[PDB]
Amino acid sequence: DEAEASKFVEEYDRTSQVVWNEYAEANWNYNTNITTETSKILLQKNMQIANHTLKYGTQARKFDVNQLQNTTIKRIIKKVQDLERAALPAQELEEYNKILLDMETTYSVATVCHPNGSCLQLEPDLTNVMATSRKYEDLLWAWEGWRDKAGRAILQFYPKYVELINQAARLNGYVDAGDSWRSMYETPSLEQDLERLFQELQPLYLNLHAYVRRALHRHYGAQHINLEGPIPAHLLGNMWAQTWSNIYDLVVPFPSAPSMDTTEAMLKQGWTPRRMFKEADDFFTSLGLLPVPPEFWQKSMLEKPTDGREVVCHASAWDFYNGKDFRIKQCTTVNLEDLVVAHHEMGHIQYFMQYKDLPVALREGANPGFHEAIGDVLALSVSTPKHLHSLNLLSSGGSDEHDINFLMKMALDKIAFIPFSYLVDQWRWRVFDGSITKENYNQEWWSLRLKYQGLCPPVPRTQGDFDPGAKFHIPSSVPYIRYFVSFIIQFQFHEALCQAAGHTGPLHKCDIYQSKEAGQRLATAMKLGFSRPWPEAMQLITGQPQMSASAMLSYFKPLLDWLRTENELHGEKLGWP
Ligand SMILES: *[C@@H]1O[C@H](CO)[C@@H](O)[C@H](O)[C@H]1NC(C)=O
Ligand SMILES: *[C@@H]1O[C@H](CO)[C@@H](O)[C@H](O)[C@H]1NC(C)=O
Ligand SMILES: C[C@H](NC(=O)O)C(=O)O
Ligand SMILES: [Cl-]
Ligand SMILES: [Cl-]
Numbered sequence: 114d115e116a117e118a119s120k121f122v123e124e125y126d127r128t129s130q131v132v133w134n135e136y137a138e139a140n141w142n143y144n145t146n147i148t149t150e151t152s153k154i155l156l157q158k159n160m161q162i163a164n165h166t167l168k169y170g171t172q173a174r175k176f177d178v179n180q181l182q183n184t185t186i187k188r189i190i191k192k193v194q195d196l197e198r199a200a201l202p203a204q205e206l207e208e209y210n211k212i213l214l215d216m217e218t219t220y221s222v223a224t225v226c227h228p229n230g231s232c233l234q235l236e237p238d239l240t241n242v243m244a245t246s247r248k249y250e251d252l253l254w255a256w257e258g259w260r261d262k263a264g265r266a267i268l269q270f271y272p273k274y275v276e277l278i279n280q281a282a283r284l285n286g287y288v289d290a291g292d293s294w295r296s297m298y299e300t301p302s303l304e305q306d307l308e309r310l311f312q313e314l315q316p317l318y319l320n321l322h323a324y325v326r327r328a329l330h331r332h333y334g335a336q337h338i339n340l341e342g343p344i345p346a347h348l349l350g351n352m353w354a355q356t357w358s359n360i361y362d363l364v365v366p367f368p369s370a371p372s373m374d375t376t377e378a379m380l381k382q383g384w385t386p387r388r389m390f391k392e393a394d395d396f397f398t399s400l401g402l403l404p405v406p407p408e409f410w411q412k413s414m415l416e417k418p419t420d421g422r423e424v425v426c427h428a429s430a431w432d433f434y435n436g437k438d439f440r441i442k443q444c445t446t447v448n449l450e451d452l453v454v455a456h457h458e459m460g461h462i463q464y465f466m467q468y469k470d471l472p473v474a475l476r477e478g479a480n481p482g483f484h485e486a487i488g489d490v491l492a493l494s495v496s497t498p499k500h501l502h503s504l505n506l507l508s509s510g511g512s513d514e515h516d517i518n519f520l521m522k523m524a525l526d527k528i529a530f531i532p533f534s535y536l537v538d539q540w541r542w543r544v545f546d547g548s549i550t551k552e553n554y555n556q557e558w559w560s561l562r563l564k565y566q567g568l569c570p571p572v573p574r575t576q577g578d579f580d581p582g583a584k585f586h587i588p589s590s591v592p593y594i595r596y597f598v599s600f601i602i603q604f605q606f607h608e609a610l611c612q613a614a615g616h617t618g619p620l621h622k623c624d625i626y627q628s629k630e631a632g633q634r635l636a637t638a639m640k641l642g643f644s645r646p647w648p649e650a651m652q653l654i655t656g657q658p659q660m661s662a663s664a665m666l667s668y669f670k671p672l673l674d675w676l677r678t679e680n681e682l683h684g685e686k687l688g689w690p
């Protein structure tokens with residue numbers, strides 16, 4: 114047993130590195146250049162990797178895992194026994210791979226055309242409309258249009274997608290795909306752990322929702338906003354209403370304290386996509402963490418090409434499984450929002466580099482949530498007025514009004530996102546376990562959109578509509594619940610790192626810039642890769658073992674107080690029906 118396990122892992126590790134690096138490349142070529150040639154080659158390279166997976170997956174399954182004395186070897190072999198999609202029969206595997214490609218290609222090339230000659234794209238066009246327009250009918254056109262284009266187009270695929278991904282899941286020992294995805298956390302109590310967390314952040318959200326619904330009532334008119342009902346999903350400044358920081362202007366707590374146009378600020382001082390990432394790279398190295406290799410700047414696609422190429426714009430980071438080749442693919446726009454997303458992605462790159470010497474099978478985050486949080490943690494410090502001013506993007510600084518305005522801006526981003534990030538997989542886990550048929554896809558999506566977010570669709574939905582497909586992570590088949598976890602624990606890391614950095618005072622005023630003791634804690638944890646259960650990583654960083662919403666509640670605490678008084682004096686009626 115033991116002698117033969119050890120050897121299997123070594124062979125599996127050295128062959129996977131090669132095969133996976135080739136797949137990455139093909140996959141990279143397609144994402145950054147959507148053509149027929151690059152699609153075929155990608156599909157081609159799918160069968161190769163599936164073959165590698167089946168050879169070692171089958172091998173692995175012949176080992177009695179619970180009877181191996183080594184923990185590191187035992188964890189690797191068990192993971193290898195999960196063939197995932199590769200568990201499917203040749204035929205079903207090729208159909209499945211084609212469906213994923215077709216879904217992701219459909220979403221990435223969809224346009225919404227006008228009567229003004231002009232067809233708009235998600236980035237940056239339709240995104241800019243949702244963030245800057247304050248015209249109900251204009252926002253409605255983009256909101257409805259995008260779903261008419263992307264949403265509708267993904268429906269014909271999805272039912273088959275669900276059938277195939279559940280089969281693949283059952284073929285790997287799980288009940289269905291949701292069960293598979295949830296196991297990535299190795300936490301039986303996951304569902305209930307998360308619902309407790311969600312509930313904890315309820316008062317804070319209900320108070321933000323109500324304060325923002327009042328603001329929108331002020332701007333769009335009583336005839337469009339019910340102060341006792343849900344909010345029209347198209348008025349929050351973001352295509353999916355997942356973050357509401359783009360309508361900061363309509364909800365400024367203290368407008369008497371002026372706001373610097375950070376975007377104008379960045380454009381004026383000539384900030385470019387490259388500059389942004391360089392700044393992100395600087396923050397990481399300031400913490401003593403690793404800088405991105407020169408190769409990174411060479412090969413990355415830090416901005417939407419202009420050579421006619423058609424690409425998958427959505428932000429993502431890439432590991433090429435060779436310990437040197439790491440890239441990021443982002444259609445970066447010059448603004449504060451993307452400056453944060455750039456850090457988020459640089460957070461992924463850092464992780465890749467931190468655990469690049471572990472066996473490939475363990476080259477993952479403690480759990481999906483960790484991978485997602487790293488960059489957001491630093492971004493939290495980058496976003497502080499003080500740090501923003503040191504980048505000459507803000508003028509200041511000091512006043513309680515400037516303090517509450519900042520907390521609001523952050524709340525519009527972080528708090529607003531909680532119910533959404535919770536919702537997405539609540540819908541999918543149910544779709545996967547069969548409680549939601551293709552007959553009720555959309556209806557159930559909006560039941561949850563209302564129940565958790567307090568949102569209603571500006572235009573009644575009709576048969577054929579499949580609004581879930583209008584969200585990247587759906588056709589792209591990327592689990593979403595990792596972001597929910599991310600938003601909870603990033604604050605737990607922020608609070609831990611800040612304590613380490615010697616920060617005293619309100620948590621929201623913390624900036625870990627250049628904190629060596631802070632980078633030391635992150636690095637030690639990122640180094641573990643997936644070698645250990647995540648509670649140990651949570652422990653190395655925060656000094657305890659659990660997710661908790663106390664850090665996030667404490668950060669916003671001042672804002673929570675402000676919100677209660679504010680809503681209370683306007684006789685606001687929290688929540689909806
Ligand atoms: C994109 O792919 C096509 C065909 O695969 C190729 O001809 C072209 O050179 C690639 N574009 C760029 C910019 O490299
Ligand atoms: C088992 O072997 C692996 C790889 O050689 C090693 O990383 C690990 O430390 C060993 N585990 C134990 C418990 O000895
Ligand atoms: C928050 C997440 N970020 C990402 O994909 O980089 C999203 O876009 O919905
Ligand atoms: Cl929607
Ligand atoms: Cl996940």
Ligand SMILES: [Zn+2]
Pocket residue numbers: 457461484485
């Ligand atoms: Zn991410």
